[PDB]
């Protein structure tokens, strides 16, 4: 409905007790002008979990499309039973770092000229459908860093445990 919960608060690590220097960091997959973070495989429970998977999307060129895939609860039995995505209203709402904690923010207020198509393949542009996309504008004047969380770290299969996925989108100035 586009409203932000001003009281909501979280952290990159969540409850995993993993510190930022131990994250499994990795770049997005950048094909022409679509940058993708696919969490299908990265979040399945394993013996070594909980791990933090941090998919880093870095943009400094015009009209890039960002697509984030977060596997749905029950899309495969057992694997994603306890998965949670934050913010619920992504991509309209994102998270940003304010005084060392992650808080909700409107993406359109953060980057002027943002295109959000209401529908992705005739489906709602929302994580409840397993994917979100947006398109960055032709010109950006302010560096900007915002986050998505696709946390499967509360799913357990015996001694196997799912992972917490982070998307860090880092927009730099461009278009001059």
């Amino acid at each position, epitope marked *: 409905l586009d409203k932000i919960d001003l009281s909501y608060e979280t952290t990159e690590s969540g409850d995993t007790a993993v510190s930022e220097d131990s994250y499994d*960091k990795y770049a997005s997959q950048n094909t022409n002008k679509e940058y993708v973070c696919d969490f299908t495989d990265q979040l399945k429970p394993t013996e070594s979990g909980p791990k933090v998977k941090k998919c880093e999307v870095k943009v400094n060129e015009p009209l890039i499309k960002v697509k984030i895939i977060c596997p749905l609860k029950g899309s495969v039995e057992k694997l994603y039973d306890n998965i949670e995505y934050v913010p619920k209203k992504s991509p309209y709402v994102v998270l940003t770092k304010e005084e060392t904690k992650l808080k909700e923010k409107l993406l359109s207020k953060l980057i002027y000229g943002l295109l959000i198509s209401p529908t992705v393949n005739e489906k709602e542009n929302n994580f409840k459908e397993g994917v979100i996309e947006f398109t960055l504008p032709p010109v950006v004047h302010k560096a900007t860093v915002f986050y998505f969380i696709c946390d499967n770290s509360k799913t357990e299969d015996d001694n196997k445990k799912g992972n917490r996925g982070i998307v860090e989108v880092y927009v*730099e100035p461009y278009g001059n």
Partner: single-chain antibody
Amino acid sequence: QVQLVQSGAEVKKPGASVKVSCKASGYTFTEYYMHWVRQAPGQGLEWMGWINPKSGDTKFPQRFQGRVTLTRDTSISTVYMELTRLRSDDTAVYYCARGNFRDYYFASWGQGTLVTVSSDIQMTQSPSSLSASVGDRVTITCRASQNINIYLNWYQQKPGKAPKLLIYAASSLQSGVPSTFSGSGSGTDFALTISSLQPEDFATYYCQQSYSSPLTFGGGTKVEIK
């Protein structure tokens, strides 16, 4: 268009201090972190730390914690690097370099300031030196002691010049670079490949990891003429 201009050469006695400046023109100063990188004569590149100019926040590695202080003046888009208690092994050329996405790569470099004092991920490059000829295809290897995914960049440096960035993200060709250059690798092992050596590809080539702090450089693949 983007420019970073630094103070002149300094001559110091051991026990003194040195302030080096980096004026920025051509872009919005506050939107890009500024790092410092030094180079002893005939040696490799050593990262010194970064300042965020919106906030003044610094980040240093243990080698320079308490040795060096980074300040900035947003009034005039300038950054200062003060190094205290100078000793002879501090003789070197000090570069300010503008970070892209904080520290992903260093597209833009200053001209360097020579300071002349009187009297942890390892990057591994092979070969150390080589000789070749126009038209030859040359392959250089770089090797990380840890998985760094694609957080790897390649730089060309000519004598008396700041490093040019040629490749970032392991295999992205920087704008304005001859397409004879290419990069490959993901994880621990990387290759820089020049399809046809042209007369001004004769230089020293460096790889550099941006995965985790401190930022470290390979020690240099020098590419000579016969």
